[PDB]
Amino acid sequence: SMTKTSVDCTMYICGDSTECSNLLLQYGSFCTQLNRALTGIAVEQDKNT
Amino acid sequence: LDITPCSFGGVSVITPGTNTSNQVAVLYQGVNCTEVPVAT
Numbered sequence: 319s320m321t322k323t324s325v326d327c328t329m330y331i332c333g334d335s336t337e338c339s340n341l342l343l344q345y346g347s348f349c350t351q352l353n354r355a356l357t358g359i360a361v362e363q364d365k366n367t
Numbered sequence: 368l369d370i371t372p373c374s375f376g377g378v379s380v381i382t383p384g385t386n387t388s389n390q391v392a393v394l395y396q397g398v399n400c401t402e403v404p405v406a407t
């Protein structure tokens with residue numbers, strides 16, 4: 319296995335800014351899709367183990 | 368002064384499945400349980 323990593327796409331792109339969060343919603347599912355992808359990796363570490 | 372960003376983490380919810388029950392448990396990931404009593 320490898321270290322499970324969770325990133326919050328919004329906290330990384332937009333550190334505590336409402337303005338940046340409102341602009342980030344103009345992209346839509348891009349932020350959620352990248353958390354879905356890292357969750358699929360994090361879960362299959364426990365599967366591999 | 369050191370500046371540390373305020374406590375944050377992923378939050379996971381644990382459920383029996385809803386048909387079985389409306390109870391849930393919340394896992395505040397990477398948070399010490401002194402920080403949530405200090406903290407919609």
Ligand SMILES: *[C@@H]1O[C@H](CO)[C@@H](O)[C@H](O)[C@H]1NC(C)=O
Nearest residue numbers: 382383384385386387388389
């Ligand atoms: C939920 O599970 C019960 C069995 O415990 C079943 O009878 C019921 O139909 C299930 N709910 C749905 C929406 O299918």
